[PDB]
RNA sequence: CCUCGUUGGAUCAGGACAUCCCAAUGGUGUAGAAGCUAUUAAUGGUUCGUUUGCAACGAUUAAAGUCCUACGUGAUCUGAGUUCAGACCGGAGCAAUCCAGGUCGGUUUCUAUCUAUUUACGAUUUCUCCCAGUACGAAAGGACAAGAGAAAUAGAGCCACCUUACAAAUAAGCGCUCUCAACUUAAUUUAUGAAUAAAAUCUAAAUAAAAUAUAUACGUACACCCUCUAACCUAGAGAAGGUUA
RNA sequence: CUCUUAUCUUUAAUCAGUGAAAUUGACCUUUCAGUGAAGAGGCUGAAAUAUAAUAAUAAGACGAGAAGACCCUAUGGAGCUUA
């Protein structure tokens with residue numbers, strides 16, 4: 001459950017998410033009518049003095065049975081047009097992104113591993 | 116998915132037309148039991164992808180194609196060059 | 211070293227705390243009893259940060275621009291700058307240092323000369339001259355008052371002076387400054403701007419200490435400082451802090467200085483398996499100290515406006 | 522329909538009627554002329 | 559004559575309509591889509607932060623309405639001011655002191671006597687899809703209505719799972735489930751038709767209809783008639799209530 | 804804090820013993836609109852209405868207490884300073 005001011009991990013190969021500038025990116029906004037962000041929910045990110053959109057692909061909060069609970073809050077950086085900023089994702093991504101309402105096919109194309 | 120399809124297009128106008136054309140044909144061509152398909156990426160000007168049940172087609176302009184190189188990722192499952200460049204880390208104390 | 215510093219979405223400096231608002235209109239009322247107005251601005255940013263509001267609100271009376279903090283700047287250009295100022299409309303200007311009380315004698319003769327040419331109307335018969343000092347915070351407005359007070363009245367410090375922006379809060383009562391001309395100075399809180407024009411204009415002011423580094427980011431300010439310091443060729447930060455060949459990456463240079471100062475933090479890093487607290491070199495403390503040495507002047511004489519607005 | 526304090530005919534074809542407790546001028550040629558009291 | 563004359567927040571809200579959003583319409587310099595303007599309607603809703611004396615700013619939203627209720631509301635709470643005993647600066651005074659000038663510090667308590675009040679309802683909005691990239695339009699662009707699925711919030715419940723506890727047989731949400739009908743009516747639009755010789759006219763003429771938000775005609779729930787030594791209870795402060803091979 | 808929850812103790816509540824305080828013109832002590840001093844349980848006009856306890860809430864009774872606050876008055880004081 002990502003909220004405002006939560007520290008999140010950029011699970012991507014994009015330059016902005018690299019370990020330099022150790023300060024973790026923090027959530028500024030959750031694009032939901034509730035402010036709670038779950039898997040598949042977009043958020044606005046404070047990263048390296050920039051404001052960038054990100055998509056939640058994993059979090060530590062328990063979900064419904066038969067679904068993966070991760071050890072970190074993961075996100076992928078998204079361009080304003082909606083194209084992913086990074087070109088590869090190596091960490092496992094839950095398969096539930098496929099069905100839920102939204103535009104997630106672009107991200108799934110980038111990720112080899114699904115869990 | 117069972118199949119993965121990538122298609123280049125000259126301009127954003129061309130990408131929209133073919134995406135609409137295929138969607139129109141899909142609804143016309145049976146799919147009575149199968150549900151409808153959303154068109155993704157209309158906000159973007161260079162990459163459109165439609166996720167049919169058994170097939171996913173990603174349409175993009177030339178320049179976008181080389182940048183992402185989707186074909187290499189799915190052809191070489193885990194031996195992709197960009198995926199290989201990424202590395203794992205551990206974090207002990209500085210001193 | 212990187213040719214161009216990129217922003218592409220960095221926020222501009224945001225300001226106007228309440229005290230700058232309730233004070234801003236108390237200045238306007240005081241214009242009734244004021245015979246002249248002094249603009250104080252740091253001599254490293256002759257054109258960047260000047261608050262547009264002052265000219266519009268109070269432009270009728272005679273005007274002199276004071277460029278304080280001239281010592282910790284490179285004024286080789288001067289002449290070209292002075293010509294540029296005249297084109298803008300800045301008829302009267304002179305560089306001042308308040309810690310060393312340099313060129314602070316020339317102000318009073320010039321200030322009196324301007325009042326002569328002008329008119330006084332309601333106050334025409336008064337022999338007591340009152341004038342106002344205004345500017346962006348942390349430019350030495352309060353210092354100028356004390357420095358004049360001791361160069362003419364020879365009594366000392368009358369306005370509290372501090373090393374942080376926003377020490378003087380409100381337009382206070384009159385303070386005696388001179389005796390023979392008998393000029394009186396009114397002290398006003400620093401007022402920065404509602405809008406800072408370009409974000410670079412806001413960086414240039416952050417480096418000068420006008421902006422409280424905590425609402426712009428110490429790290430971002432540090433990167434701009436390194437970016438400007440390398441372009442100007444003033445590689446004086448590689449001797450104060452041993453950096454060998456020098457560098458263009460802020461993370462690398464901040465690493466070395468943190469090592470030189472033996473500073474460490476326990477920082478929560480976010481990894482795949484969870485959260486772990488790891489001892490780390492103090493990048494933030496390094497940035498704060500690195501900016502301080504620049505502000506003291508030991509990192510070299512810098513004129514920020516040299517590149518964009520050479521004129 | 523503009524509701525006006527005083528209603529005035531605006532053209533030849535304008536005509537006047539008493540509908541639902543109020544006076545109306547209705548014009549077939551120009552709907553702009555429709556008015557209510 | 560130079561000067562200078564209580565209100566924030568929290569909690570819970572009651573009400574007005576001069577309507578911000580949701581709904582029904584007229585007009586257009588309304589092709590479509592965006593807009594502008596008017597009428598009717600008070601239905602439920604009307605966010606989270608940064609700066610902190612409020613005034614701008616950031617990100618959202620269907621929308622972030624305008625007001626009344628002695629700042630609506632301190633015998634519910636809390637900040638600043640009113641504003642003092644200490645102390646400093648700047649100015650005034652020979653001084654004591656002073657300033658509708660700065661700043662730092664700074665203790666109002668209340669056990670409820672009375673009125674009043676403390677046990678049910680029939681849901682709102684957004685997004686995607688379909689219609690359909692169709693109608694319209696030279697293109698650009700780009701919809702109605704009808705239909706389907708998702709969420710959010712609100713209300714009402716619940717414990718198979720998950721989660722946090724009692725390292726108790728339970729309670730909770732961060733978990734799960736359920737939410738609906740409109741007799742009758744306003745702006746407005748049609749049909750028949752006189753006053754008014756018409757192949758006129760929607761009618762504060764006789765008439766037939768359609769058409770917001772409301773609501774209770776209409777339904778759900780409740781009903782039973784009362785053993786009680788005592789014990790036990792998923793019922794409970796007491797009392798009441800339920801159970802007893 | 805979002806956003807609150809569980810458990811234990813104190814208190815609470817029932818039983819037994821002991822037993823204060825401020826307060827109190829009298830009261831058989833209602834709602835709405837009007838009137839009126841910004842004002843009404845008690846007046847005017849409508850309305851509502853078997854009688855009494857127990858436990859809770861704090862809108863009202865300009866709720867109850869203090870040597871509080873502000874201003875004005877007295878040919879009332881007192882401390883302080885002087886020219």
Ligand SMILES: Nc1nc2c(ncn2[C@@H]2O[C@H](COP(=O)(O)OP(=O)(O)NP(=O)(O)O)[C@@H](O)[C@H]2O)c(=O)[nH]1
Pocket residue numbers: 278279280281282306307308309310345346347348349350351352353354370371372373374375376377378379398399400
């Ligand atoms: N090197 C140098 N430092 C100076 C000079 N004048 C002032 N400073 C420094 O600036 C600070 C004082 O600034 P100050 O007079 O308070 O400026 P201000 O604008 O009146 N303050 P504010 O922001 O509150 O309005 C001190 O750190 C002082 O040493 C100068 O001429 N040279």
Ligand SMILES: [Mg+2]
Pocket residue numbers: none
């Ligand atoms: Mg209300």
Ligand SMILES: [Mg+2]
Pocket residue numbers: none
């Ligand atoms: Mg109305």
Ligand SMILES: [Mg+2]
Pocket residue numbers: none
């Ligand atoms: Mg009260």
Ligand SMILES: [Mg+2]
Pocket residue numbers: none
């Ligand atoms: Mg203290």
Ligand SMILES: [Mg+2]
Pocket residue numbers: none
């Ligand atoms: Mg009480």
Ligand SMILES: [Mg+2]
Pocket residue numbers: 702
């Ligand atoms: Mg439609």
Ligand SMILES: [Mg+2]
Pocket residue numbers: none
């Ligand atoms: Mg007893």
Ligand SMILES: [Mg+2]
Pocket residue numbers: none
């Ligand atoms: Mg009685």
Ligand SMILES: [Mg+2]
Pocket residue numbers: none
């Ligand atoms: Mg009675």
Ligand SMILES: [Mg+2]
Pocket residue numbers: 843
């Ligand atoms: Mg009354």
Ligand SMILES: [Mg+2]
Pocket residue numbers: none
């Ligand atoms: Mg009575």
Ligand SMILES: [Mg+2]
Pocket residue numbers: none
């Ligand atoms: Mg009681």
Ligand SMILES: [Mg+2]
Pocket residue numbers: 861862863
């Ligand atoms: Mg009360």
Ligand SMILES: [Mg+2]
Pocket residue numbers: none
């Ligand atoms: Mg009282």
Ligand SMILES: [Mg+2]
Pocket residue numbers: 878
């Ligand atoms: Mg007398």
